[PDB]
Design a protein around this ligand. Structure first.
Ligand SMILES: Nc1ccn([C@@H]2S[C@H](CO)[C@@H](O)[C@H]2O)c(=O)n1
Ligand SMILES: Nc1ccn([C@@H]2S[C@H](CO)[C@@H](O)[C@H]2O)c(=O)n1
Lengths: 235, 235
């Protein structure tokens, strides 16, 4: 439907535009992603919204129920599938991608599993060497939107989704779900501090970093993001 | 149908049995794989035959039409998807797997792309470090069957399959198809010499290496492989 896996020739030169949300969106931001992509299509871009549920491996549950065995290959899978989707749609085909998560944020999830002992130091070093080669072939996002919901909100949304059958219970216990969500939130607070430095005198000079007002209603929030993304659409 | 992606608990201890074909099966060996798996099910094993067409990424054609960009991530994908399939079905769930290709043979296909310049030396080093960590978690196959068809036969089978629509044209030209098939055949002749040494005083002590009589009819060939695989089935 979104033609994400078309190996035919480009039907346009250069890469498209790359917009990414960054935060602990453990319950997803699918309405925001899809609405934003739709607003870019209205402006005339070939725009696709890509939630993480496009990248979840069929074995996803095992990264949380059998972490010592599956967290390393499943983390490799997130990185790799995201890489290939961007390399084809954004770079090769010049499309506009609105991502729930950029290629810059996957390493944080490896760091979590390393601190728990599910991924070894040697596995992490191998991941880092492949990640460095892959990320060197993908442009930085053009617009990064920092949105880290608080863990209690993430968990309330997840609990409702699991109860209503709209997503499977992917964790092995209620406590494990809460603990991963809190660990990711804590890491994302540090990651976002890093982003504010990166954007000013690190490798994200050249990227627009957008921070929201957490007290702003949702409606002021999509409107703010939409305005900045529409600056990129070339008719 | 084959329940390859079941994240539920094991329904059996220890890993299952691991049988692999090794050779330039560019047109596939799907009848042999499926027949052999069926013979092991008859003997009472939970056996699955896995052809490479289970692992072909949706972007497969780009590794041959845009090799300089896609050969590295697509090779990572072959390794990773094969790893996860084995880690779940063979190791975690103790099933018996009859593979068209084992995890030991993927590195040869990276070597091909390195010699053509499609994969850089630095990309290959990163691949090798991840491959070493992944392969350390997968048992050696128990029975390896050397079958390297000659390139003219591979190409005759491929040409017929493409003409009849039973598989897409995955190469960008007739000449590129012939050249990859010949490069793989040549590498496999060297790989099979290596196997004969590995099995006797390298890391495949402990594995049964089966070599066929290339002059033997197909029927003597499935019968020979079936006899040796059935030595492994525990009722
Ligand atoms: N590299 C990654 C990216 C995402 N996730 C999980 S997958 C699930 C998305 O629906 C949600 O739990 C994310 O936090 C992950 O574990 N590792
Ligand atoms: N690591 C690998 C494994 C397999 N193949 C190709 S994929 C196709 C199978 O139908 C056939 O062409 C194989 O030779 C590959 O390129 N790299």
């Amino acid at each position: 439907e979104q033609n994400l896996y078309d190996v035919g020739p480009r039907d346009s030169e250069g890469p498209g535009h790359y917009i990414a949300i960054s935060g602990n969106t453990a319950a997803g931001k699918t309405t925001l992603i899809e609405t934003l992509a739709g607003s870019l299509r209205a402006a005339g871009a070939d725009a696709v919204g890509v939630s993480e549920r496009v990248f979840h491996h069929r074995y996803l549950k095992l990264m949380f129920s059998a972490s010592a065995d599956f967290a390393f290959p499943i983390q490799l899978s997130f990185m790799l599938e995201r890489h290939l989707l961007l390399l084809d749609n954004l770079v090769r085909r010049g499309r506009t991608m609105v991502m729930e998560r950029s290629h810059l944020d996957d390493a944080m999830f490896v760091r979590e599993h390393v601190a728990s002992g599910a991924i070894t130091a040697a596995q992490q070093r191998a991941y880092t060497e492949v990640s460095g080669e892959l990320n060197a072939r993908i442009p930085n996002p053009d617009l990064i939107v920092l949105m880290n919901p608080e863990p209690e909100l993430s968990l309330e949304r997840l609990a409702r989704a699991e109860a209503e059958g709209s997503r499977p219970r992917e964790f092995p216990s209620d406590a494990a779900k809460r603990a991963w969500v809190h660990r990711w939130y804590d890491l994302y607070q540090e990651l976002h501090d890093d982003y504010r430095r990166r954007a000013v005198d690190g490798d994200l000079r050249g990227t627009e970093l957008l921070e929201l007002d957490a007290a702003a209603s949702p409606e002021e929030k999509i409107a703010t993001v939409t305005a900045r993304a529409r600056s990129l659409v070339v008719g």
